[PDB]
Amino acid sequence: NMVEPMDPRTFVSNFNNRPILSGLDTVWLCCEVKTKDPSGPPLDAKIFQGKVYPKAKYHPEMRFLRWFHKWRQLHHDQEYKVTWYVSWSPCTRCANSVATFLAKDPKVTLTIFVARLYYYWDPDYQQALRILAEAGATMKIMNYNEFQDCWNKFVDGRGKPFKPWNNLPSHYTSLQATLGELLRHLMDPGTFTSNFNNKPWVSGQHETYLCYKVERLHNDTWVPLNQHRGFLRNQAGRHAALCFLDLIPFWKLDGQQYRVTCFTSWSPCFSCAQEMAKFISNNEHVSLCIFAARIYDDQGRYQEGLRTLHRDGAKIAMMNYSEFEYCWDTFVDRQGRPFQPWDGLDEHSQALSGRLRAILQNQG
Amino acid sequence: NMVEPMDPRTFVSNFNNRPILSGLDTVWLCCEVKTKDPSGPPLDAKIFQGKVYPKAKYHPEMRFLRWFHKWRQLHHDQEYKVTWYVSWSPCTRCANSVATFLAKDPKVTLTIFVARLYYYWDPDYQQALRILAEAGATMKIMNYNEFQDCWNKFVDGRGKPFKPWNNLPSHYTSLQATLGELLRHLMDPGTFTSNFNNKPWVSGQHETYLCYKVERLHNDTWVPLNQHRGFLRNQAGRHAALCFLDLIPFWKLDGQQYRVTCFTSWSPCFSCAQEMAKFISNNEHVSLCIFAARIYDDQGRYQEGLRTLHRDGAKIAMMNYSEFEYCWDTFVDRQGRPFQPWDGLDEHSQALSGRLRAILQNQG
Ligand SMILES: [Zn+2]
Ligand SMILES: [Zn+2]
Ligand SMILES: [Zn+2]
Ligand SMILES: [Zn+2]
């Protein structure tokens, strides 16, 4: 079995799913590496533990990555299926290191079972889970069978079986509903209504939401690629347009002709416009179309940015009624409700279209 | 009277307060300069017009600043009361230029009557109005009397009297309530509840709100200065802690000893911590007290920043129930309702206190 199994009290203290209020100290990761055949024996199994504070370098997911890099050198270059049972959901830094690892090595596939979710006072925690999902990691809450499997495979049970605790199924249900909500797919209607708006009073909105879709040129028709379809938002300290650029390479598009469409609630500031100019200049097989609900004055060179983005290709347009309705129909968890326009939508669209046409062309 | 009066049709289309949906073109500013004596005759009166797009250098508030700078060199060095009737509220750039002019020149006081509010798709429009108010500008909605006075003093009416339009009062009332809301002074309760919270799930909250109060040391008792008391929030492209430092010189504090207290919904990132350390090093008569609702991990050197701030003086502490309740009582438009704690408030306070005590100190 295992070289040094987990102590039953450690398991009971850490692999549990009832809500608690204490801060984190140590997190545990039970890890199993298998071949491509699910009924093959496990190639290896190891337990990792790490202190949450004060450095993420020592979190068990980082220890796993460093371990796995040396461990894989000692076998043939083959496909691996890795499974983690982890007592708490990973931190943002580790979510990003794992997503990058998965993206750079397609021969590894990862399934992550978490006992409980932790959020780390991170305003961008949701986007960390979403980046893991985009890099191919499967993430589920541990249910009865997984707790019992981790008990059998990793705990020094001394013949004793997994004894469940009271309300285990109920905590599972609540956590899994929470996880599914964090991994949505379709945007919340209140989110759409708070952000995709063009009234000149913007209700103090500093967030930028971005709905994206990709089409491929195939026998001279544009065919949708619905597996690359969704929405994102800005991060604390990283603008939404930059996160969109960071998302694109996870799609691993080939050299065919692609058309990427973004509906963004704010047009790009100058710096994000310049990064988008660089991206489209280095990826000319990719046609970029940006529709903005509002024009963002970054108190600087945003007009130069919009003109530079327009000149390097890229269609830039203000959203009209039709684009708003399309975004609602296509990206919103609307449950059959129709689009509901707000007063002045068409007039503000017309005024903003004029301002944009004036920015392009010239006068400033 | 005046050398160039406004044409009645110009007044009718621009000095009106009914809601409209069109974009802005030209804005009008009727200006009257008087001495400190209300019963003195007006020394001068001038009309300015400016195109809103594409450069704020030509907005009428800027033309007024350039004109007035030359005008006052040619008149007596005395105190002046300036009155503006302006067809729309100023843009951010003009609001800040006027605030700076007012702050650097105490012998001039400005009253601004606006026919209608315009928001320019600016997420920080509220702060522009608020910085105008903190520099001493009085800002009111034009009522019947102000429309009538503007008509008499500035319009080529050819003996005709001011004729009001239908719903002048009702639009006035709606507009003045909106303006009063923009200059609040006391924080809306929903704002407080959405931002001053310490659950480790932060609801993606990227805003930082900051409540401040000032004390004076007088014969070794700490006296409040309730004229320097309020709240602010971050801007697009400028963090809340920087906005607070920018605010402090508007207070024109002398060389006595002052204690400034911040209750912030996020502890400062590294760059803001360093700017605050610079501030307290250049203003040793000002003792700084920071209470944070949550610790903000800026994905960089934020722990060094908190340590530097703590080493340079400056008390850094996490908010407990007592501080939350004090902020509710002191800064919130609570209308007599008591503070309502949320679940886990005390436990999350204790966990964050532990983390902060570990960050100060050391361990990594
Ligand atoms: Zn981590
Ligand atoms: Zn940007
Ligand atoms: Zn202006
Ligand atoms: Zn900061």
Residue numbers in the entry:
A (entry chain B), B (entry chain A): 7 to 142, 147 to 246, 255 to 382
What did the study's authors say about this model?
Two fl rA3G mutational constructs (termed FKL and E/Q) yielded well-behaved proteins and crystals in different conditions that diffracted to 2.47 and 2.40 Å, respectively. Additional changes in these two constructs improved the solubility and yield of rA3G including replacement of an 8-residue CD1 loop 8 by the 4-residue loop 8 from hA3G-CD2 (as in both E/Q and FLK constructs), further mutations F126Y on CD1 loop 7, K180S/L184S on CD1 h6, and 8-residue deletion of the CD2 loop 3 (as in the FKL construct). The constructs also contain catalytic E259 to Q/A mutation to avoid potential toxicity during recombinant protein expression. While the FKL structure shows a canonical fold of its CD2 domain, the E/Q structure shows significant alteration in CD2 conformation, with major changes on helix 2 (h2), loop 3, loop 4, and the Zn-active center. When aligning the FKL and E/Q structures via their CD1 domain, the CD2 domain of the E/Q structure shows a rotation of ~29° compared with the CD2 of FKL structure, causing the E/Q CD2 domain to shift ~15 Å downward and ~8 Å toward CD1, and resulting in a much closer packing interaction with CD1. The CD1 and CD2 domains in the FKL structure interact with each other mainly through h3, h4, and loop 7 of CD1 and h1, h2, β2, and loop 3 of CD2. The overall CD1-CD2 packing interface has a buried surface area of ~623 Å2 for the FKL structure and ~700 Å2 for the E/Q structure. Combined mutations in FKL partially affect its catalytic activity.
APOBEC3s (A3s) are an APOBEC subfamily in mammals that restrict viruses, including retroviruses, endogenous retroelements, Hepatitis B virus, and Epstein-Barr virus. The double-domain A3G, A3F, A3D, and single-domain A3H (haplotypes II, V, and VII) are active in restricting HIV-1 through deaminase-dependent and independent modes, with A3G being most potent among them. For the double-domain A3s, the deaminase activity resides only on CD2, but the catalytically inactive CD1 is important for regulating nucleic acid binding, processivity, oligomerization, packaging into HIV virion, and effective anti-HIV activity. In order to understand the structural basis of domain organization and molecular regulation of the complex biological functions of A3G, we determined the double-domain structure of rA3G.
